[PDB]
Amino acid sequence: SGWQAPGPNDVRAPCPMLNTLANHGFLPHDGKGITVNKTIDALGSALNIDANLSTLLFGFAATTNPQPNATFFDLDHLSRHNILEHDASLSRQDSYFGPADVFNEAVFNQTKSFWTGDIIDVQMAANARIVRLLTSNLTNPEYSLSDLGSAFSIGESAAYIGILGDKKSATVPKSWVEYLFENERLPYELGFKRPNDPFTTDDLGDLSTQIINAQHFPQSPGKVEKR
């Protein structure tokens, strides 16, 4: 009632949030034929993401459809290596090792170990992202991260803090984030409520700046701050 696991013909993405909105039916349950109007309405209805930001994200998602100048995408188009999907994900392995779309327990265990507290703050988020970049560079001989991939990696850590939690304190309960990644269901039962205030492109930019500012390398090894 309100949630159903993907069945045999349903397609899913490397994005835990889109997978979640498909499992709840905010997006089409089968993960196919997502248009700009469906995107605005799903992200609006479930999370209170503003239309300007939903439109921007749809822009990128549409570039993953193999058909050129496309006006829709499917969730599985998003899995195409090095368009939006990138190495050093928090809950997925690098394509080099295996399929980069499904939840990977080994990788997620690394990420969790840097959330050292019941409340995840900007510092813990920044720290987990950084260890995934460094781990992927030293274990994956085909490791790469484009300027777009770097921007998306920083944006993705800002998102789970800002959209799932309180964007003002820039904090989110650890148990809410763990539940979303592990179940691809919204943690309503743990206290998650759709926020009253819309989440905008400038909220995303600001939190991305806080992530960058909380990185303290004596010397940056590779692409750790590109936007």
Ligand X SMILES: *[C@@H]1O[C@H](CO)[C@@H](O)[C@H](O)[C@H]1NC(C)=O
221 and 137 in contact (C-beta within 8 Å)? Answer: yes
The binder of Mg ion chosen from 57, 75, 100, 161 (CB under 5 A): 100
Give the DSSP letter of residue 166.
B
Q: Is 169 flagged in the annotation as binding?
A: no
222 binds, among ligand X, ligand HEM, Mg ion, none (CB under 5 to 8 A by kind): ligand X
199 and 163 in contact (C-beta within 8 Å)? Answer: yes
Task: Give min distance, CB of 36 to ligand X, in A.
Answer: 32
Which two tokens mark 12? 């899913």
Is residue 57 within the footprint of ligand HEM (CB under 6 A)?
yes
The binder of ligand X chosen from 29, 80, 185, 223 (CB under 6 A): 223
With contacts defined by CB under 6 A, name the span among 76-84, 95-103, 105-113, 114-122 that binds ligand X: 105-113
With contacts defined by CB under 6 A, name the span among 3-11, 13-21, 118-126, 168-176 that binds ligand HEM: 13-21
52 and 200 in contact (C-beta within 8 Å)? Answer: yes
Question: Please, what's the b/e burial string for 207-221 (b: 16 or more CB within 10 A of its CB; e: otherwise)?
Answer: bbebbeebeeeeeee
18 binds, among ligand C=Cc1ccccc1, ligand HEM, Mg ion, none (CB under 5 to 8 A by kind): ligand HEM
Ranges assigned E (strand) in 134-221: 171-173
Q: Which residues bind ligand X (CB under 6 A)?
A: 105-106, 109, 137, 143-145, 221-223
